[PDB]
Amino acid sequence: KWTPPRSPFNLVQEILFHDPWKLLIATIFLNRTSGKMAIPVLWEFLEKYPSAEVARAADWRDVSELLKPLGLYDLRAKTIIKFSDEYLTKQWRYPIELHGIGKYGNDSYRIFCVNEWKQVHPEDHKLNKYHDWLWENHEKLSLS
Structure with missing residues:
Protein backbone atom coordinates (compact mmCIF):
# COMPACT_ATOMS: atom_id res chain seq x y z
CA LYS A 1 0.00 0.00 0.00
CA TRP A 2 3.03 2.22 0.57
CA THR A 3 4.10 3.84 -2.68
CA LEU A 24 18.40 -4.89 -2.98
CA ILE A 25 20.39 -6.23 -5.95
CA ALA A 26 20.75 -2.65 -7.11
CA THR A 27 22.20 -1.66 -3.73
CA ILE A 28 24.67 -4.53 -3.98
CA PHE A 29 25.84 -3.22 -7.40
CA LEU A 30 25.91 0.40 -6.23
CA ASN A 31 27.79 -0.32 -3.00
CA ARG A 32 31.05 1.64 -3.16
CA THR A 33 30.59 1.70 -6.93
CA SER A 34 29.93 4.67 -9.21
CA GLU A 47 18.10 -8.88 -18.12
CA LYS A 48 19.99 -12.20 -17.96
CA TYR A 49 19.11 -13.02 -14.32
CA PRO A 50 15.64 -11.42 -13.89
CA SER A 51 14.74 -13.12 -10.61
CA VAL A 63 27.86 -13.77 -13.54
CA SER A 64 31.38 -12.52 -12.78
CA GLU A 65 32.05 -12.35 -16.54
CA LEU A 66 29.14 -9.95 -16.86
CA LEU A 67 30.44 -7.98 -13.87
CA LYS A 68 33.95 -7.45 -15.21
CA PRO A 69 33.50 -3.68 -15.90
CA LEU A 70 33.17 -3.18 -12.16
CA GLY A 71 36.25 -5.07 -10.96
CA LEU A 72 36.22 -7.58 -8.08
CA TYR A 73 33.84 -9.51 -10.37
CA ASP A 74 34.37 -12.93 -8.75
CA LEU A 75 33.50 -11.67 -5.28
CA ARG A 76 30.52 -9.63 -6.48
CA ALA A 77 29.10 -12.57 -8.46
CA LYS A 78 29.29 -14.97 -5.52
CA THR A 79 27.74 -12.42 -3.13
CA ILE A 80 24.84 -11.77 -5.49
CA ILE A 81 24.15 -15.51 -5.86
CA LYS A 82 24.42 -16.12 -2.10
CA PHE A 83 22.21 -13.16 -1.14
CA SER A 84 19.61 -14.33 -3.67
CA ASP A 85 19.56 -17.78 -2.12
CA GLU A 86 19.23 -16.42 1.43
CA LEU A 98 20.87 -11.48 4.59
CA HIS A 99 24.33 -12.00 3.10
CA GLY A 100 25.51 -9.00 1.11
CA ILE A 101 23.08 -6.52 2.68
CA GLY A 102 24.31 -3.76 4.97
CA LYS A 103 23.00 -0.40 6.25
CA TYR A 104 22.75 1.03 2.75
CA GLY A 105 20.61 -1.83 1.46
CA ASN A 106 18.50 -1.96 4.64
CA ASP A 107 17.92 1.83 4.60
CA SER A 108 16.94 1.60 0.93
CA TYR A 109 14.53 -1.21 1.77
CA ARG A 110 13.03 0.62 4.77
CA ILE A 111 12.38 3.78 2.77
CA PHE A 112 11.17 2.21 -0.47
CA CYS A 113 9.79 -1.27 0.23
CA VAL A 114 8.12 -0.80 3.60
CA ASN A 115 6.86 2.42 5.13
CA GLU A 116 9.56 3.29 7.68
CA TRP A 117 11.28 6.22 6.00
CA LYS A 118 10.66 8.42 9.02
CA GLN A 119 12.76 6.06 11.12
CA VAL A 120 15.61 5.82 8.59
CA HIS A 121 18.78 7.93 8.77
CA PRO A 122 20.70 7.29 5.49
CA GLU A 123 24.43 7.58 5.05
CA ASP A 124 24.26 7.35 1.26
CA HIS A 125 24.34 10.69 -0.60
CA LYS A 126 21.51 10.02 -3.05
CA LEU A 127 19.40 8.35 -0.36
CA ASN A 128 19.87 11.46 1.80
CA LYS A 129 18.78 13.64 -1.12
CA TYR A 130 15.63 11.63 -1.56
CA HIS A 131 14.97 11.33 2.18
CA ASP A 132 15.48 15.07 2.86
CA TRP A 133 13.11 15.81 -0.03
CA LEU A 134 10.55 13.35 1.32
CA TRP A 135 10.68 15.12 4.70
CA GLU A 136 10.56 18.54 3.03
CA ASN A 137 7.44 17.71 1.01
CA HIS A 138 5.68 14.91 2.87
CA GLU A 139 3.03 17.40 4.05
CA LYS A 140 2.26 18.42 0.48
CA LEU A 141 2.38 14.88 -0.91
CA SER A 142 -0.03 12.94 1.38
CA LEU A 143 2.24 10.74 3.47
CA SER A 144 3.41 9.59 6.85
Whole structure:
Protein backbone atom coordinates (compact mmCIF):
# COMPACT_ATOMS: atom_id res chain seq x y z
CA LYS A 1 0.00 0.00 0.00
CA TRP A 2 3.03 2.22 0.57
CA THR A 3 4.10 3.84 -2.68
CA PRO A 4 7.29 5.91 -2.42
CA PRO A 5 6.64 9.23 -4.19
CA ARG A 6 8.65 10.10 -7.30
CA SER A 7 11.47 12.55 -6.56
CA PRO A 8 13.28 14.87 -8.99
CA PHE A 9 16.38 12.77 -8.33
CA ASN A 10 15.29 9.61 -10.14
CA LEU A 11 17.05 7.22 -7.77
CA VAL A 12 17.20 3.71 -9.21
CA GLN A 13 15.34 2.53 -6.07
CA GLU A 14 12.30 4.46 -7.32
CA ILE A 15 12.11 2.23 -10.40
CA LEU A 16 12.72 -1.08 -8.59
CA PHE A 17 10.88 -0.73 -5.27
CA HIS A 18 8.07 -2.96 -6.60
CA ASP A 19 10.47 -5.92 -6.38
CA PRO A 20 12.52 -5.88 -3.13
CA TRP A 21 14.95 -8.42 -4.58
CA LYS A 22 15.73 -6.14 -7.53
CA LEU A 23 15.99 -3.10 -5.28
CA LEU A 24 18.40 -4.89 -2.98
CA ILE A 25 20.39 -6.23 -5.95
CA ALA A 26 20.75 -2.65 -7.11
CA THR A 27 22.20 -1.66 -3.73
CA ILE A 28 24.67 -4.53 -3.98
CA PHE A 29 25.84 -3.22 -7.40
CA LEU A 30 25.91 0.40 -6.23
CA ASN A 31 27.79 -0.32 -3.00
CA ARG A 32 31.05 1.64 -3.16
CA THR A 33 30.59 1.70 -6.93
CA SER A 34 29.93 4.67 -9.21
CA GLY A 35 26.35 4.91 -10.44
CA LYS A 36 27.51 5.84 -13.94
CA MET A 37 29.38 2.55 -14.10
CA ALA A 38 27.20 0.24 -12.01
CA ILE A 39 23.73 1.04 -13.41
CA PRO A 40 24.42 -0.06 -17.02
CA VAL A 41 25.81 -3.40 -15.77
CA LEU A 42 22.87 -3.73 -13.38
CA TRP A 43 20.35 -3.57 -16.22
CA GLU A 44 22.41 -6.16 -18.08
CA PHE A 45 22.44 -8.49 -15.09
CA LEU A 46 18.71 -8.07 -14.45
CA GLU A 47 18.10 -8.88 -18.12
CA LYS A 48 19.99 -12.20 -17.96
CA TYR A 49 19.11 -13.02 -14.32
CA PRO A 50 15.64 -11.42 -13.89
CA SER A 51 14.74 -13.12 -10.61
CA ALA A 52 16.07 -14.35 -7.28
CA GLU A 53 15.23 -17.89 -8.40
CA VAL A 54 17.37 -17.48 -11.50
CA ALA A 55 20.19 -15.63 -9.69
CA ARG A 56 20.34 -18.23 -6.91
CA ALA A 57 20.81 -21.18 -9.29
CA ALA A 58 23.30 -19.22 -11.44
CA ASP A 59 26.94 -19.98 -12.22
CA TRP A 60 29.14 -17.39 -10.52
CA ARG A 61 31.80 -17.71 -13.22
CA ASP A 62 29.23 -16.53 -15.78
CA VAL A 63 27.86 -13.77 -13.54
CA SER A 64 31.38 -12.52 -12.78
CA GLU A 65 32.05 -12.35 -16.54
CA LEU A 66 29.14 -9.95 -16.86
CA LEU A 67 30.44 -7.98 -13.87
CA LYS A 68 33.95 -7.45 -15.21
CA PRO A 69 33.50 -3.68 -15.90
CA LEU A 70 33.17 -3.18 -12.16
CA GLY A 71 36.25 -5.07 -10.96
CA LEU A 72 36.22 -7.58 -8.08
CA TYR A 73 33.84 -9.51 -10.37
CA ASP A 74 34.37 -12.93 -8.75
CA LEU A 75 33.50 -11.67 -5.28
CA ARG A 76 30.52 -9.63 -6.48
CA ALA A 77 29.10 -12.57 -8.46
CA LYS A 78 29.29 -14.97 -5.52
CA THR A 79 27.74 -12.42 -3.13
CA ILE A 80 24.84 -11.77 -5.49
CA ILE A 81 24.15 -15.51 -5.86
CA LYS A 82 24.42 -16.12 -2.10
CA PHE A 83 22.21 -13.16 -1.14
CA SER A 84 19.61 -14.33 -3.67
CA ASP A 85 19.56 -17.78 -2.12
CA GLU A 86 19.23 -16.42 1.43
CA TYR A 87 16.61 -13.91 0.36
CA LEU A 88 14.44 -16.83 -0.85
CA THR A 89 15.48 -19.49 1.66
CA LYS A 90 16.26 -17.62 4.88
CA GLN A 91 13.63 -16.46 7.35
CA TRP A 92 14.09 -12.74 7.68
CA ARG A 93 12.32 -9.63 8.94
CA TYR A 94 14.77 -7.09 7.50
CA PRO A 95 17.20 -7.66 4.58
CA ILE A 96 20.22 -6.61 6.68
CA GLU A 97 20.05 -10.16 8.06
CA LEU A 98 20.87 -11.48 4.59
CA HIS A 99 24.33 -12.00 3.10
CA GLY A 100 25.51 -9.00 1.11
CA ILE A 101 23.08 -6.52 2.68
CA GLY A 102 24.31 -3.76 4.97
CA LYS A 103 23.00 -0.40 6.25
CA TYR A 104 22.75 1.03 2.75
CA GLY A 105 20.61 -1.83 1.46
CA ASN A 106 18.50 -1.96 4.64
CA ASP A 107 17.92 1.83 4.60
CA SER A 108 16.94 1.60 0.93
CA TYR A 109 14.53 -1.21 1.77
CA ARG A 110 13.03 0.62 4.77
CA ILE A 111 12.38 3.78 2.77
CA PHE A 112 11.17 2.21 -0.47
CA CYS A 113 9.79 -1.27 0.23
CA VAL A 114 8.12 -0.80 3.60
CA ASN A 115 6.86 2.42 5.13
CA GLU A 116 9.56 3.29 7.68
CA TRP A 117 11.28 6.22 6.00
CA LYS A 118 10.66 8.42 9.02
CA GLN A 119 12.76 6.06 11.12
CA VAL A 120 15.61 5.82 8.59
CA HIS A 121 18.78 7.93 8.77
CA PRO A 122 20.70 7.29 5.49
CA GLU A 123 24.43 7.58 5.05
CA ASP A 124 24.26 7.35 1.26
CA HIS A 125 24.34 10.69 -0.60
CA LYS A 126 21.51 10.02 -3.05
CA LEU A 127 19.40 8.35 -0.36
CA ASN A 128 19.87 11.46 1.80
CA LYS A 129 18.78 13.64 -1.12
CA TYR A 130 15.63 11.63 -1.56
CA HIS A 131 14.97 11.33 2.18
CA ASP A 132 15.48 15.07 2.86
CA TRP A 133 13.11 15.81 -0.03
CA LEU A 134 10.55 13.35 1.32
CA TRP A 135 10.68 15.12 4.70
CA GLU A 136 10.56 18.54 3.03
CA ASN A 137 7.44 17.71 1.01
CA HIS A 138 5.68 14.91 2.87
CA GLU A 139 3.03 17.40 4.05
CA LYS A 140 2.26 18.42 0.48
CA LEU A 141 2.38 14.88 -0.91
CA SER A 142 -0.03 12.94 1.38
CA LEU A 143 2.24 10.74 3.47
CA SER A 144 3.41 9.59 6.85
